[PDB]
C-alpha cells in the first residue's frame, strides 16, 4: 500500500442562518468522505457504500450517541471561547483529529482546534502537551493539561486506535481506495497574445501526481504554470502543466503517477 490517512472534522457555528447547521462532523479516508453528522439530522450516516455495507447498525447507534455528546461539548466550548474573547454574534469553532499510515509502515497522528479559522490549540502527543497561540488558548491549555488521563487517552487513540480504524476502512473500501487508474495525457498548442505547450492529464486515481516539462531531455525548464489537481466528478482527477516557447529546443512532458513514469516528446 501507499500512504493513507483517516481524519474527522467537527465544525460549530454560534448564530447559524436557517440553512446552516449548528454542528457538523465529517470523517474522511484519504479524500472520500465516509461518515457525516449534523445537528439537524442528529444521526451519524455513511457517505460511501462500502461503509454502510461493512458496519453493523450498533456502530452507527453508539457513535450517534457519542456525536450528540460531542455536539453539546462543542456548543459549550464555543460559548466559553466567545465569553473569553468578549465576542458577540456568529463565530466558528473547528476540530480536526486523524492519523496517517505511510508506505514504510510508520504512523503519524494529529489533533488540533481552531477558532474563527485560525489555529487555536495544537496537541503534541510526544511531549503530551497543548501548544497555545494566545492567552485564551493558554487558559484552555492550563485547563486541559490538568487532565493527564485524557492526554494519555488521546495518545493511545492517535497511535493505536486510529491506525486500526484506518486499516479496517481500507479493507472495507479496497476496490476504491486501493485501485489505480492510469492517466490519459495529451499535448496541446495554444496561441497567446506567442505559442505555448499544455500537457493535460485526466481520468486518474489517486489524485497525487507529478507533472513537469523538460528541454533537451536533461534540464527542467523555468516559468512553468501548473494547474491544480481537481476532481472531475466521476471519482477521477485531472491536472496540467503549461510552458511558453522563442528558441528552437526539444521539449518533452514528464508525468509520474503511482510509480509509473511517462514521457511525451513533442516535435
Amino acid at each position, epitope marked *: 500500500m501507499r500512504t493513507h490517512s483517516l481524519r474527522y472534522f467537527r465544525l460549530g457555528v454560534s448564530d447559524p442562518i436557517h440553512g446552516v447547521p449548528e454542528f457538523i462532523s465529517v470523517g474522511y479516508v484519504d479524500s472520500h468522505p465516509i461518515t457525516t453528522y449534523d445537528s439537524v439530522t442528529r444521526q451519524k450516516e455513511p457517505r460511501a457504500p462500502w461503509m454502510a455495507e461493512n458496519l453493523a447498525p450498533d456502530h452507527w447507534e453508539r457513535y450517534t450517541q457519542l456525536l450528540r455528546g460531542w455536539q453539546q461539548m462543542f456548543k459549550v466550548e464555543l460559548k466559553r471561547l466567545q465569553r473569553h474573547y468578549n465576542h458577540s454574534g456568529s463565530h466558528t469553532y473547528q476540530r480536526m483529529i486523524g492519523c496517517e499510515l505511510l508506505e514504510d509502515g510508520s504512523t503519524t497522528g494529529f489533533l488540533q482546534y481552531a477558532y474563527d479559522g485560525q489555529d487555536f490549540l495544537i496537541f503534541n502527543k510526544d511531549t503530551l502537551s497543548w501548544l497555545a497561540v494566545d492567552n485564551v488558548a493558554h487558559t484552555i491549555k492550563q485547563a486541559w493539561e490538568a487532565n493527564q488521563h485524557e492526554l494519555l487517552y488521546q495518545k*493511545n487513540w492517535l497511535e493505536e486506535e486510529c491506525i486500526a480504524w484506518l486499516k479496517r476502512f481500507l479493507e472495507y473500501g479496497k476496490d476504491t481506495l486501493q485501485r489505480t487508474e492510469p492517466p490519459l495525457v495529451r499535448v496541446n498548442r495554444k496561441e497567446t497574445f506567442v505559442t505555448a505547450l499544455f500537457c493535460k492529464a485526466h481520468g486518474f486515481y489517486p489524485p497525487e501526481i507529478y507533472m513537469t516539462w523538460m528541454k533537451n531531455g536533461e534540464e527542467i525548464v523555468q516559468e512553468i504554470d501548473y494547474g491544480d489537481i481537481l476532481p472531475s466528478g466521476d471519482g477521477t482527477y485531472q491536472a496540467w502543466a503549461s510552458i511558453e516557447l522563442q528558441s528552437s529546443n526539444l521539449y518533452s512532458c514528464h508525468v509520474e503517477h503511482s510509480g509509473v513514469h511517462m514521457v511525451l516528446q513533442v516535435p
Partner: antibody
Amino acid sequence: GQNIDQPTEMTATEGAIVQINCTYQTSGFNGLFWYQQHAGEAPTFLSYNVLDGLEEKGRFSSFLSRSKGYSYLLLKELQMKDSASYLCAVMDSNYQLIWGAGTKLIIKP
Amino acid sequence: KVTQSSRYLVKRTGEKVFLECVQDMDHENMFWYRQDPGLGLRLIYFSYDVKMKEKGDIPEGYSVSREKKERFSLILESASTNQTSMYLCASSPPGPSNEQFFGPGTRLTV
C-alpha cells in the same frame, strides 16, 4: 463476543503482596479502569491505565500490557481494611465501558 | 458528594418506583447501574446532560428523566421480580478517561 476475565476470589495473609489479574478480549481498546468496592458500599476509583507500563500510587500498583491485553492490580503490604472486591473495566473501540464481575479479596489476619 | 435515595427499599410487584441520584459536583454525565451476583455492573440508562437521555445496555422495563442537572431519576414503570438488584448511580464530567463517582447504592427487593 467481548468479555473481561478476572478471578472470582483471592485470599492472602496480612502484610503480604497480592496480584489481581485482569485479562480482556475486546475489539479495540481505550483504557482500563480499576475500582475498589467494599461490600454494600459505593465503588471507588483506583487507577486508569491506557499506555503500556506500571503506575505506582501509594501501596497500589497498576500495570497494563496492551499487546497481551492484560492488566494486574498490585497491593503491597496488605492490610485488613484492603478486604473488598476489585472491579476491572475496559473500554472498547465503540467507547462502551465493559465491566468485569469483580475479584473478592480476602485478607487473613 | 453523590447521594441517592434510601439505601434499602421494599416494594410490591406492579408498583411505580422512584429512585433518585443527586450530585453537587456540577457533573454532566450521570449513570444508573444495577449490580447482580456473578455479573459486573450493567448500564441501565445514561444521561449526557440536562434533558438528554440515551438508553443503556438493559433499558427494558426502565425509564429515566433528567430535568435538573443534579438530579437523575430512575423510574420503574411496572415492578417485576427480576428487578430485584443493587442499584448504583454515578456521575462524572464528559470524557472517556474520566472516572465516575458513585452514590451509596440502593438495595431493592421485590
